[PDB]
Design a protein around this ligand. Structure first.
Ligand code: HEM
Length: 153
């Protein structure tokens, strides 16, 4: 459903993200927690971090942020053909972590904010629109997998 051109814009900016996995990952989570503090409660250890500096200095948050981006990167490189990649992720996020689709919207917003902040020249209107569609596709498909597992989140 995304055009080839749009996928290229997505993967163009993603190569930039990959130049600093920990950094982008960290800032996305920090942004998420700031914009939607209720999300922080999902994180057993990061829950207890009281300042921005503490979060910035957290190897936990760096490694988890990078883990999120690494999994998302693999999904986006499938260019929509991500049925296999979504299976274990829907399982864990539906039944174990219990992350509502709204929370995936929240983190999608965080991703777009961080990418625009760090890469404005490589993330203008068309690039943002393409990333928006890619993440919308992600959320739609993972929502369907949620329901197959009995989770109406
Ligand atoms: C782009 C969307 C997301 C991606 C690609 C993603 C990816 C991952 C990956 C790869 C893992 C490790 C393996 C696993 O348990 O599945 C993970 C774990 C986890 N995810 Fe996500 N995630 C996303 C969104 C979220 C959001 C928005 C939340 C909470 C608001 C969340 C909560 C968690 C938690 C609590 C863990 C386990 C952390 C731990 O116990 O160490 N995820 N995620």
């Amino acid at each position: 459903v995304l055009s080839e051109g749009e996928w290229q814009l997505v993967l163009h900016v993603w190569a930039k993200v990959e130049a600093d996995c920990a950094g982008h990952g960290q800032d996305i989570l920090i942004r998420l927690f700031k914009s939607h503090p209720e999300t922080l409660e999902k994180f057993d250890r990061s829950k207890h971090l009281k300042t921005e500096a503490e979060m910035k200095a957290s190897e936990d948050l760096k490694k988890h942020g990078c883990t999120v981006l690494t999994a998302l990167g693999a999904i986006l490189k499938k260019k929509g053909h991500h049925e296999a990649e979504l299976k274990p992720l829907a399982q864990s996020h539906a039944t174990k972590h219990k992350i509502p689709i709204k929370y995936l919207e929240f983190i999608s917003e965080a991703i777009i904010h961080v990418l625009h902040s760090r890469h404005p020249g490589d993330f203008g209107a068309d690039a943002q629109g393409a990333m928006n569609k890619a993440l919308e596709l992600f959320r739609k498909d993972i929502a369907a997998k949620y329901k197959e597992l009995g989770y109406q989140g």
